Design a protein around this ligand. Structure first.
Ligand code: HEM
Lengths: 457, 373
């Protein structure tokens, strides 16, 4: 049998801390053009009340004190990149006068500004002053440093530090058990297993080379323009709803067999793409959060979220239920081989890299379930723009539930690469996915060829 | 069906519970609902055991699961962390917690949810101070304790959250016995250093978090509601400490938020009037019913916060008598009085809104309560 993983634990810091595979890809694909976004996470908070600006400034500084990755730069060339961990991150938070009308423009420009990860800290903040008791705090983090979960951690840790600093003391907290460098060294130790033929990593490399053997470079989709050599990564969105009744009927076929809602929707979407003309050999990817079993990662900031591609075979005009069972079988098997970083897989497949395209999969699906306080302040999320996209299409669906924990509608949005698609093209896709989900909910035995995708005008 | 003894109608025991006599057999499990017989069962530590080579790790440090003499030894070791001297030093910090939570309510502006912002927040924070959790980790730490019990989350996540806040305590234990502080852990190891194992300290701190939160939160919620429904009684809480402490004890008895103490097991045949609790049969005590017994006091079913205190059993009775009773009485006094100091015209934000009772946990409470002022 295959050997296991090394212990994930605090480690004596080496002189040359490696990047994770996810970071190295982020680093390499940084700024391919100066007209390219901008792979960032941006959050803005509206703050109403008496803001202690010096305290906020000290607090932001304290969050980076707590998390090494926020005071990390990434110097070197492709062969020498390492994580350089500074003692501190410089924060200067002089307020910027602003009006309600000019504010969205200012928020957008600050969040769009490019990082040079060889000499800049991978995050950035600004404070906009609207009136004496009305401010907006804008925070932008580069994806080399944060996944989406990480942004909640950031504001939980901001609030804690603002509390203390506002009251005249430095924060009194226990240090993290793990810093991101400890995770990076762990992943490296795991990948070092290729050395040993019976290692974990070798067993998983074999799985993926086998599972993904012979996939096309691209998914066939209804493009409005040819794929440019250099992506703009601009993105549009279209809303999307599945009503409560159909949502609940779909769930009934959940418990007949073992498949949860994320896999049901993955089935339906795969049938839609075959029906759109993509063929019967498809890869639909999804982004998993950090492994919840790894308890020391919960309180951390880092690029922990992991891409997860599942190949589905749709030949022989399968019933919806047949597609579900193929999805569920594929996912259950792939689920067990997630220690290989996704970003390592293009190599394993000897895939010619491209800037213009996301490797392995170009269509993503996210189906999530439903669901910070600062002293002397009413706080709220100030709406900011849609993030830069690397995928061609990305569905983000949320399951609503009532008070009895029952299915109460699916709500969501389709993000698309504006370089490739017009809004109406994406709107058709979104509406057809809802239609497929309705039909398949009422008639779970329906086959791909019987799917009605006619849209009313 | 939910068990008859956990059933309330408003503030009162439910009607089917008010129907069961002093001591009846129910599904062989006995229901003791009389004040006398409940005092007898809790008080007789020789003929009744509380336990279910024996004790699993989750039950370690949970004094409720110990009979004497083990119970005697462990409870004694915890003594230096519960002195009156130590309660009185807690007081300014308890007042500070209560203040910061009242500030939150004011910020959030009228109306505010008393339960979400005040009741569910003060007891947790007071507990963090009792055991000595670092100041600015207390929100984090409480989040984990709460996730650990939040039934809506999968049993997976819940075990995760439980482990993490236990890991925190272990980490915290290392620091404060490597060179002791003078907080909870410190004063206990300074006195009984190589008596109490690290397994016991670890377990005690956990059980403390799970013993003193839900009870106090229910009391804060139901107490504020009970007082607003009888606004003449509020005056008892706008005077001196002696009146506030008297009012608090009446609210504790009238509300009796815990439905039952730990089940008891007859260690032998125990005679009670003309019935016999045979060895091995189990006794469930209804604390609410016992505290409504006419043999305890006249007008038991009326709230009167100016009435002289009575030997109620909301805190239990005997060797397992609530270890956080003094701390509860101090919290509740500080909380109730600071609330009306800050909001003298406190009221239900919406008198027409359905009252939202908490029925799932071991303590009666409210899940929310919108208040204005
Ligand atoms: C808010 C009102 C509270 C009520 C009504 C209450 C109720 C009770 C009851 C009825 C018992 C006896 C259980 C039995 O004999 O089976 C008990 C014991 C206990 N309580 Fe409380 N509790 C409250 C708050 C607290 C607090 C704040 C703490 C700790 C900080 C706490 C910690 C404990 C512990 C450790 C025991 C076990 C004592 C032993 O077995 O020796 N409780 N509580």
């Amino acid at each position: 049998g295959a050997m296991g993983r090394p212990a994930l634990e605090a480690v004596t810091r080496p002189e040359r801390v490696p990047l994770t595979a996810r970071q190295l890809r982020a680093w390499l694909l940084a700024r391919p053009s100066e007209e390219t976004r901008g792979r960032h996470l941006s959050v803005a908070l509206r703050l109403r009340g008496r803001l202690d600006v010096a305290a906020l400034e000290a607090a932001l500084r304290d969050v980076a004190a707590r998390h090494e990755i926020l005071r990390t730069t990434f110097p070197g060339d492709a062969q020498t990149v390492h994580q350089h961990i500074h003692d501190a991150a410089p924060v200067r938070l002089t307020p910027v006068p602003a009006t309600e009308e000019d504010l969205p423009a200012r928020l957008a420009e600050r969040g769009e500004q490019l990082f040079d990860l060889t000499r800049d800290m991978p995050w950035r903040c600004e404070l906009f002053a609207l009136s004496e008791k009305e401010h907006v705090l804008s925070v932008t983090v580069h994806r080399i440093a944060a996944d989406d979960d990480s942004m909640d951690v950031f504001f939980r840790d901001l609030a804690a530090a603002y509390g203390a600093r506002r009251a005249g003391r430095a924060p009194e907290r226990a240090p993290l058990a793990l810093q991101f460098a400890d995770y990076a060294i762990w992943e490296q130790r795991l990948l070092d297993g290729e050395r040993e033929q019976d290692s974990l990593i070798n067993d998983q490399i074999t799985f993926w080379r086998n599972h993904l053997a012979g996939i096309d470079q691209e998914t066939v989709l209804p493009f409005d323009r040819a794929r440019p050599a250099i992506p703009s990564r601009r993105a549009g969105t279209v809303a999307l709803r599945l009503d409560a009744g159909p949502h609940a009927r779909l769930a009934e076929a959940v418990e007949s067999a073992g498949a949860d809602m994320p896999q049901l929707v993955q089935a339906a979407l795969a049938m839609l793409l075959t029906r759109y003309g993509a063929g019967t050999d498809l890869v639909i990817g999804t982004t998993l959060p950090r492994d919840e079993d790894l308890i020391d990662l919960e309180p951390m900031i880092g690029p922990f979220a992991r891409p997860f591609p599942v190949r589905t075979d749709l030949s022989a005009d399968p019933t919806f239920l047949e597609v579900v069972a193929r999805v569920q079988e594929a996912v259950r098997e792939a689920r067990q081989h997630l220690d290989v970083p996704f970003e390592k897989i293009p190599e394993l497949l000897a895939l010619p890299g491209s800037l213009s395209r996301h490797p392995v999969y170009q269509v993503g699906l996210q189906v999530r379930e439903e669901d910070a306080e600062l002293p002397a302040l009413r706080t709220s999320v100030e709406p900011t723009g849609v993030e830069a996209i690397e995928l061609d299409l990305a569905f983000a669906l949320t399951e609503r539930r009532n008070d009895d924990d029952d299915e109460d509608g699916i709500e969501g949005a389709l993000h698309y690469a504006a370089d490739l698609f017009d809004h109406d093209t994406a709107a058709s896709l979104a509406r057809r996915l809802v239609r497929v989900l309705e039909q398949v909910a009422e008639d779970p035995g329906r086959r791909i060829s019987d799917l009605d995708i006619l849209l009313d005008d | 069906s939910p068990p008859i003894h956990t059933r309330r109608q408003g503030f009162d025991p439910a009607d089917e519970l008010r129907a069961a006599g002093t001591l009846t057999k129910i599904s062989t499990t006995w229901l003791a609902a009389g004040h006398a017989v409940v005092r007898q069962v809790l008080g007789d530590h020789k003929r009744f055991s509380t336990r279910r080579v024996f004790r699993p790790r989750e039950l370690v440090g949970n004094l409720m699961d110990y009979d004497p003499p083990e119970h005697t030894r462990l409870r004694h070791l915890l003594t230096p962390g519960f002195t009156q001297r130590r309660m009185r030093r807690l007081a300014p910090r308890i007042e500070e917690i209560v203040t910061d939570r009242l500030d939150a309510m004011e910020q959030a502006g009228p109306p505010a949810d008393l339960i979400e912002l005040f009741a569910d927040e003060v007891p947790g924070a007071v507990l963090c101070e009792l055991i000595g959790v670092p100041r600015d980790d207390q929100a984090m730490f409480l989040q984990l304790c709460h996730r650990h019990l939040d039934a809506s989350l999968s049993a997976r996540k819940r075990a995760a959250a439980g482990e993490a806040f236990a890991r925190y305590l272990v980490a915290m234990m290392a620091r404060e016995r490597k060179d002791p502080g003078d907080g909870f852990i410190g004063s206990i190891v300074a006195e009984h250093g190589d008596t109490i194992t690290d397994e016991e300290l670890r377990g005690v701190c956990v059980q403390l978090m799970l013993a003193g939160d839900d009870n106090v939160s229910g009391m804060i919620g139901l107490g504020v509601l009970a007082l607003l429904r009888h606004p003449e009684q509020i005056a008892a809480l706008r005077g001196d400490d002696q009146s506030a402490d008297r009012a608090v004890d009446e609210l504790i008895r009238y509300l009796t938020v815990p439905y039952a103490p730990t089940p008891r097991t007859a260690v032998e045949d125990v005679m009670v009037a003309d019935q016999v609790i045979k060895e091995g049969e189990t006794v469930l005590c209804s604390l609410p019913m016992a505290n409504r017994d006419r043999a305890l006091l006249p007008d038991a079913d009326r709230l009167d916060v100016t009435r002289t205190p009575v030997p109620h059993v909301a805190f239990g009775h005997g060797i397992h008598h609530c270890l956080g009773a003094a701390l509860t009485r101090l919290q509740l006094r500080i909380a109730y009085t600071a609330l009306w100091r800050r909001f003298p015209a406190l009221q239900l934000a919406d008198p027409a809104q359905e009252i939202m009772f908490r029925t799932s946990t071991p303590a009666y409470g409210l899940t929310s309560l919108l208040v204005a002022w």
